[PDB]
Amino acid sequence: FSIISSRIIWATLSTFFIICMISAYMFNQIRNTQLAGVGPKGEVMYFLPNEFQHQFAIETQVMVLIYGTLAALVVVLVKGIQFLRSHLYPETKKAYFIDAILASFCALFIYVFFAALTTVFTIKSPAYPFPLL
Amino acid sequence: PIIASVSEHQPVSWPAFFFDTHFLIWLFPAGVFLLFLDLKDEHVFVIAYSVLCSYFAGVMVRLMLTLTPVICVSAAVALSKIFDIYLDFKKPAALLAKLIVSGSFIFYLYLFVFHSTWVTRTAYSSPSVVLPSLIDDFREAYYWLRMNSDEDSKVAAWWDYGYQI
Amino acid sequence: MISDEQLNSLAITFGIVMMTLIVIYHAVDSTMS
Amino acid sequence: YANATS
Amino acid sequence: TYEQLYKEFHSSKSFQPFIHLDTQPKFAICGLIVTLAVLSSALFAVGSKSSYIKKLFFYTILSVIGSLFAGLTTVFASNSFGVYV
Amino acid sequence: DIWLSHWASTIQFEEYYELTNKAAKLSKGFSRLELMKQIQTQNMRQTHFVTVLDMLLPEGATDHYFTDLVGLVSTSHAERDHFFIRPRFPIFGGWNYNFTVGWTNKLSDFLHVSSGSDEKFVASIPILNGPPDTVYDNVELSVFLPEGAEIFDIDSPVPFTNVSIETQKSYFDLNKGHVKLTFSYRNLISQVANGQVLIKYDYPKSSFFKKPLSIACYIFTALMGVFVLKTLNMNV
Amino acid sequence: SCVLSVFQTILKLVIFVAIFGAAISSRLFAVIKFESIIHEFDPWFNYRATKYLVNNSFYKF
Ligand SMILES: CCCCC/C=C\C/C=C\CCCCCCCC(=O)O[C@H](COC(=O)CCCCCCCCCCCCCCC)COP(=O)([O-])OCC[N+](C)(C)C
Ligand SMILES: CCCCC/C=C\C/C=C\CCCCCCCC(=O)O[C@H](COC(=O)CCCCCCCCCCCCCCC)COP(=O)([O-])OCC[N+](C)(C)C
Ligand SMILES: C[C@H]1CC[C@]2(OC1)O[C@H]1[C@H](O)[C@@H]3[C@H]4CC[C@@H]5C[C@H](O[C@H]6O[C@@H](CO)[C@H](O)[C@@H](O)[C@@H]6O)[C@@H](O)C[C@@]5(C)[C@@H]4CC[C@@]3(C)[C@@H]1[C@H]2C
Ligand SMILES: C[C@H]1CC[C@]2(OC1)O[C@H]1[C@H](O)[C@@H]3[C@H]4CC[C@@H]5C[C@H](O[C@H]6O[C@@H](CO)[C@H](O)[C@@H](O)[C@@H]6O)[C@@H](O)C[C@@]5(C)[C@@H]4CC[C@@]3(C)[C@@H]1[C@H]2C
Ligand SMILES: C[C@H]1CC[C@]2(OC1)O[C@H]1[C@H](O)[C@@H]3[C@H]4CC[C@@H]5C[C@H](O[C@H]6O[C@@H](CO)[C@H](O)[C@@H](O)[C@@H]6O)[C@@H](O)C[C@@]5(C)[C@@H]4CC[C@@]3(C)[C@@H]1[C@H]2C
Numbered sequence: 001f002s003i004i005s006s007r008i009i010w011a012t013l014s015t016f017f018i019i020c021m022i023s024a025y026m027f028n029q030i031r032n033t034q035l036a037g038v039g040p041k042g043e044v045m046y047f048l049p050n051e052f053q054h055q056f057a058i059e060t061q062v063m064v065l066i067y068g069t070l071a072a073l074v075v076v077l078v079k080g081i082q083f084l085r086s087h088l089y090p091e092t093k094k095a096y097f098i099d100a101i102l103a104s105f106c107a108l109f110i111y112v113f114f115a116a117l118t119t120v121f122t123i124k125s126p127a128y129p130f131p132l133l
Numbered sequence: 134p135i136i137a138s139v140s141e142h143q144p145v146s147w148p149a150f151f152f153d154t155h156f157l158i159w160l161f162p163a164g165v166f167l168l169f170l171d172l173k174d175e176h177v178f179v180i181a182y183s184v185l186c187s188y189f190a191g192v193m194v195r196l197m198l199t200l201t202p203v204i205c206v207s208a209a210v211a212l213s214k215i216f217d218i219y220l221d222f223k224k225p226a227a228l229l230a231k232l233i234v235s236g237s238f239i240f241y242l243y244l245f246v247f248h249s250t251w252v253t254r255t256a257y258s259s260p261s262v263v264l265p266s267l268i269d270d271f272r273e274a275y276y277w278l279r280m281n282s283d284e285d286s287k288v289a290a291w292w293d294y295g296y297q298i
Numbered sequence: 299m300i301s302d303e304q305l306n307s308l309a310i311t312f313g314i315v316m317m318t319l320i321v322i323y324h325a326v327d328s329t330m331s
Numbered sequence: 332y333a334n335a336t337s
Numbered sequence: 338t339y340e341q342l343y344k345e346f347h348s349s350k351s352f353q354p355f356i357h358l359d360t361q362p363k364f365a366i367c368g369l370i371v372t373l374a375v376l377s378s379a380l381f382a383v384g385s386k387s388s389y390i391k392k393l394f395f396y397t398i399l400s401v402i403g404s405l406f407a408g409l410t411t412v413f414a415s416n417s418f419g420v421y422v
Numbered sequence: 423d424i425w426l427s428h429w430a431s432t433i434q435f436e437e438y439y440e441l442t443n444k445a446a447k448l449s450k451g452f453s454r455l456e457l458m459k460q461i462q463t464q465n466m467r468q469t470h471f472v473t474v475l476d477m478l479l480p481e482g483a484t485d486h487y488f489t490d491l492v493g494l495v496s497t498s499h500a501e502r503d504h505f506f507i508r509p510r511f512p513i514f515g516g517w518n519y520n521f522t523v524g525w526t527n528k529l530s531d532f533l534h535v536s537s538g539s540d541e542k543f544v545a546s547i548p549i550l551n552g553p554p555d556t557v558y559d560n561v562e563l564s565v566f567l568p569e570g571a572e573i574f575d576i577d578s579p580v581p582f583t584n585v586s587i588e589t590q591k592s593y594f595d596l597n598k599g600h601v602k603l604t605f606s607y608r609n610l611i612s613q614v615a616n617g618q619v620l621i622k623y624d625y626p627k628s629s630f631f632k633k634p635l636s637i638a639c640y641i642f643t644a645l646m647g648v649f650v651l652k653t654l655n656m657n658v
Numbered sequence: 659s660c661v662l663s664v665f666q667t668i669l670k671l672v673i674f675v676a677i678f679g680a681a682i683s684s685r686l687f688a689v690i691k692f693e694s695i696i697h698e699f700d701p702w703f704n705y706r707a708t709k710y711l712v713n714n715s716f717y718k719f
């Protein structure tokens with residue numbers, strides 16, 4: 001009903017499928033992996049340390065969150081600053097200023113999330129020389 | 134039972150996607166999303182390629198190679214769009230924001246170069262017939278077989294070492 | 299022959315030069331058109 | 332990852 | 338015959354090179370630059386929209402120079418990489 | 423194989439050996455454990471199997487290398503005038519080993535210029551450079567002179583079974599190629615055949631300068647071809 | 659403009675030269691370190707087939 005003809009719906013579906021595929025979603029089924037692990041101390045581990053070819057099943061969800069946030073921030077940087085500048089601050093007497101602020105904050109958040117990604121990757125590969133932190 | 138035993142037909146864990154594409158891995162989905170908001174026929178080709186190879190690369194590791202071209206293409210689109218806005222100098226605050234964004238992404242480019250060089254030098258630059266420490270025991274026994282055995286001689290071994298022999 | 303550290307430095311230099319020149323090209327293409 | 336047993 | 342040739346060999350001066358091997362790398366790196374310059378100019382002349390009777394003349398002279406340079410630098414670079422001609 | 427080059431002023435030696443050990447065969451077969459127990463016992467006694475060969479090279483050699491039919495061997499070590507070599511496996515009685523060694527030397531030690539003209543050269547080339555105590559059963563000694571060289575006189579200090587002259591193309595031999603002069607000898611002994619072959623040939627300056635000229639003609643032909651390909655339209 | 663086009667052409671040529679250099683220098687690591695030798699397992703069959711082709715004819719291959 002005029003909704004399977006919208007570009008945004010199919011774009012969201014396909015991008016989500018690609019994100020789940022690159023987050024190693026098929027690995028958790030071809031191999032029945034545990035959801036998480038228990039530390040020697042006794043807290044939840046959330047990540048298999050020192051292992052590069054094995055993982056828990058919650059790592060897929062964490063990586064889905066990270067990749068989706070990075071992609072959403074890039075899409076907002078490319079297409080979305082106009083929208084939310086017109087919809088957030090309605091004074092429209094200083095509009096380049098608001099665009100600059102929003103773009104710089106988007107870049108800052110992109111850096112933060114890339115640093116988080118490299119941290120969770122150096123957990124699995126404990127000798128990685130570009131932690132970006 | 135045989136296709137199940139070869140190490141090249143196994144599923145992939147998530148780190149191997151970051152190990153083979155430093156930061157092109159989170160520009161690839163964004164570049165696909167950006168190709169959807171301007172749907173042309175060429176773009177439909179790229180979208181179908183992206184989806185199919187994404188599935189096939191996570192199901193079998195040897196199929197990750199076929200995924201590497203489109204990723205680059207997709208990434209090269211997204212980045213390019215960003216540079217069409219923040220590398221276009223045509224006012225203090227706007228200039229400063231453009232500088233910030235473009236400089237962060239140029240830094241990511243340089244880091245990509247460094248990471249790629251390190252991964253190549255460390256993981257994908259060693260032959261399996263000589264081991265470093267050199268330990269050269271394959272070529273010693275193969276050359277012994279070639280020098281001190283009859284030419285019409287049959288050597289039984291596991292299939293992994295067929296070709297080399 | 300060339301050494302290992304020398305080949306590493308050569309590869310890194312080639313990469314850095316290529317990226318810098320593609321950035322300059324993109325800036326001139328986006329600004330002047 | 333090569334054409335070999337694991 | 339052996340005797341005479343031996344006496345000759347043992348009563349003569351040694352071989353003196355034309356250009357020493359240690360110098361040839363510099364000569365190669367310089368000739369490569371000269372060759373690049375000249376050839377790249379003659380390609381500009383090919384792209385030129387001027388007459389045909391003059392494009393031919395300029396291209397031919399420039400190529401007759403660039404080719405001499407390129408051959409000399411090929412010899413020097415090959416000798417400098419360890420592949421002696 | 424001895425390669426002479428006037429543009430680089432170098433002489434390059436490449437030797438391909440096919441060695442065998444005619445000592446007693448090993449009863450009970452080879453047991454790496456027994457060999458290691460002999461090594462660590464420090465039994466440096468004179469044994470009848472080859473563990474290391476010592477090649478005696480001409481004075482001032484450089485760029486040594488030691489390979490075989492399966493690749494490059496890493497157990498080789500150069501000392502003044504001497505090149506020590508360790509095969510992949512020890513050579514016991516009845517075993518074979520085919521390998522290759524090579525090095526470079528300055529041309530000014532083997533090639534002299536005639537006194538009557540600056541284009542007549544006399545070369546004196548050693549016939550054997552190998553291990554100390556060895557016997558040879560078939561020797562094919564090839565000398566490669568540059569492209570435009572014309573051989574004028576040849577002589578050997580010991581009788582040979584054959585001699586021949588032909589040509590062979592190389593890395594930049596657009597023309598006929600290097601003049602190959604081949605000698606064939608039969609029964610030779612390591613340190614009693616210490617003579618030197620004498621070759622007198624002619625090499626004019628025209629032949630010296632003709633090689634870059636040939637490369638230049640090739641490049642100029644390619645450039646003329648490019649020009650021709652970019653001066654005719656195939657539009658419809 | 660016209661100087662813009664010539665600048666872009668020269669820049670593209672230099673960029674592609676740098677691209678070729680970077681690619682080849684990145685691949686040459688194993689050849690520089692150990693030797694120029696054949697790798698893993700399938701390349702060995704490929705190499706023996708190429709040898710058979712270059713020694714014999716195309717019909718025999
Ligand atoms: C179309 C765009 C293409 C872009 C470029 C593509 C690929 C290149 C990128 C990476 C390749 C890395 C290669 C590493 C070198 C390994 C060998 C080595 O390391 O040689 C080095 C030496 O070096 C050099 O001094 C070379 C100095 C300058 C060379 C001349 C300039 C080169 C021009 C190239 C084209 C020439 C044709 C002219 C026609 C116009 C080791 O010499 P050696 O001790 O073994 O020699 C034996 C010992 N003697 C020296 C006594 C004999
Ligand atoms: C179209 C222009 C492209 C521009 C880029 C050009 C080159 C790439 C840059 C650097 C590569 C050089 C490093 C390789 C040399 C060391 C490896 C080696 O030494 O291997 C050689 C293999 O000989 C080769 O093939 C090397 C070819 C030499 C190339 C020199 C480059 C300058 C000329 C460029 C071509 C110009 C076109 C002219 C056409 C008329 C080992 O030979 P061997 O084991 O038989 O020993 C022989 C010893 N006997 C004789 C005693 C047995
Ligand atoms: C989970 C998160 C993911 C990120 C996000 O939040 C949820 O979800 C994004 C969407 O993808 C949005 C874009 C869709 C495409 C849409 C094109 C329009 O362009 C034409 O739209 C036609 C309509 O009739 C008219 O012709 C005119 O409006 C106009 O010409 C444009 O106006 C807005 C735009 C770009 C949306 C901007 C906000 C985005 C990026 C949203 C983010 C905030
Ligand atoms: C246009 C195309 C064609 C030309 C080329 O590609 C682009 O661009 C060339 C570079 O100029 C490269 C050289 C850089 C300098 C480097 C010095 C080392 O010199 C050693 O020797 C002594 C010297 O004083 C000392 O001991 C130490 O510095 C050191 O050990 C030498 O090993 C390698 C060498 C010469 C590089 C080789 C590859 C070259 C020629 C590259 C080509 C492929
Ligand atoms: C228009 C052109 C002209 C100007 C230029 O390009 C644009 O701008 C120059 C930059 O200054 C580049 C250098 C940066 C520093 C970098 C240090 C590395 O050294 C170590 O750096 C450590 C750090 O973490 C690692 O740990 C080690 O692994 C690594 O070896 C070295 O390899 C490469 C080098 C010197 C870059 C080379 C190319 C340069 C000179 C570029 C020029 C060609």
Ligand SMILES: C[C@H]1CC[C@]2(OC1)O[C@H]1[C@H](O)[C@@H]3[C@H]4CC[C@@H]5C[C@H](O[C@H]6O[C@@H](CO)[C@H](O)[C@@H](O)[C@@H]6O)[C@@H](O)C[C@@]5(C)[C@@H]4CC[C@@]3(C)[C@@H]1[C@H]2C
Pocket residue numbers: 711712713714715716
């Ligand atoms: C459908 C198309 C597909 C592409 C192609 O065309 C047809 O199909 C290939 C053919 O197979 C060609 C080979 C024919 C046999 C020929 C043997 C020669 O052997 C030499 O070996 C020397 C050793 O030193 C001897 O001394 C010399 O006498 C002797 O000539 C040698 O020239 C190479 C080889 C294999 C040809 C190369 C070109 C090929 C590959 C052709 C391609 C252009």
Ligand SMILES: *C(=O)c1ccc(-c2c3ccc(=[N+](C)C)cc-3oc3cc(N(C)C)ccc23)c(C(=O)[O-])c1
Pocket residue numbers: 052125140255256257258259265332333
């Ligand atoms: C395929 O099954 C496979 C490919 C690469 C690697 C691997 C290495 C292989 C050989 C090495 N040498 C002998 C130099 C070193 C390797 O190091 C690696 C490092 C990583 N990181 C940094 C996570 C990944 C892979 C390799 C293997 C393997 O694990 O041995 C396997």
Ligand SMILES: *[C@@H]1O[C@H](CO)[C@@H](O[C@@H]2O[C@H](CO)[C@@H](O)[C@H](O)[C@H]2NC(C)=O)[C@H](O)[C@H]1NC(C)=O
Pocket residue numbers: 279280284440441442491518519520
């Ligand atoms: C290594 O060299 C030896 C010695 O020449 C070769 O042995 C000869 O091989 C041929 C063909 O198999 C036989 O007809 C001869 O009788 C062998 N001679 C001796 C003394 O054994 C051997 O073939 C060479 N191996 C390789 C791989 O080239």
Ligand SMILES: *[C@@H]1O[C@H](CO)[C@@H](O[C@@H]2O[C@H](CO)[C@@H](O)[C@H](O)[C@H]2NC(C)=O)[C@H](O)[C@H]1NC(C)=O
Pocket residue numbers: 584585586
């Ligand atoms: C000396 O010269 C060659 C040694 O290479 C031999 O004669 C030739 O041998 C090749 C080898 O197959 C043949 O193809 C030629 O037909 C032979 N003859 C000629 C004229 O080249 C032989 O050992 C000697 N030839 C003599 C003494 O005539």
